[PDB]
Amino acid sequence: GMGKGKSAIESQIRMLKLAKEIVEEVASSFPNLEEVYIFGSRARGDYLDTSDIDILFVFKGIKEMNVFDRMYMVSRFIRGNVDYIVLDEGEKDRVKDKVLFWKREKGFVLL
Length: 111
Hints:
- By secondary structure, this protein is α+β, with helices and mostly antiparallel strands.
- It has a single domain, classed as 2-Layer Sandwich (Beta Polymerase, domain 2), CATH 3.30.460.10.
- 32% of the residues lie in helices and 26% in strands.
- The protein has helices at 6-29, 41-44, 67-74, and strands at 33-39, 53-59, 82-88, 98-103, 107-108.
- Strands 3-2-1-4-5 form a five-stranded mixed sheet.
- The radius of gyration is 14 Å and the shape is elongated.
- The protein starts with 5 loop residues before the first helix and ends with a strand.
- InterPro entries: NT_sf, Polymerase_NTP_transf_dom, Type_VII_TA_antitoxin.
């Protein structure tokens, strides 16, 4: 039965809603944002109520953008107990164990 308690579930809801707000802003700012994934413990299931949420932003056409330029693309949108990675479309397989959160052609998944 209910392997996650009330506090963990409420934190999952709250963290997904914060990720949604951040993605809405990033997606409105970059036409080349293509997909967003949740990775880490909140994607896998081994999270605590205090766990951060990890967001993978996947953009088209940034293969040549260095890691500092990539960070600068989303830095100002990040707030709360959130960590992130920015990858090109061709590099997204580098993060295993992830959940599709948003896609340009789908909007948000389950939200």
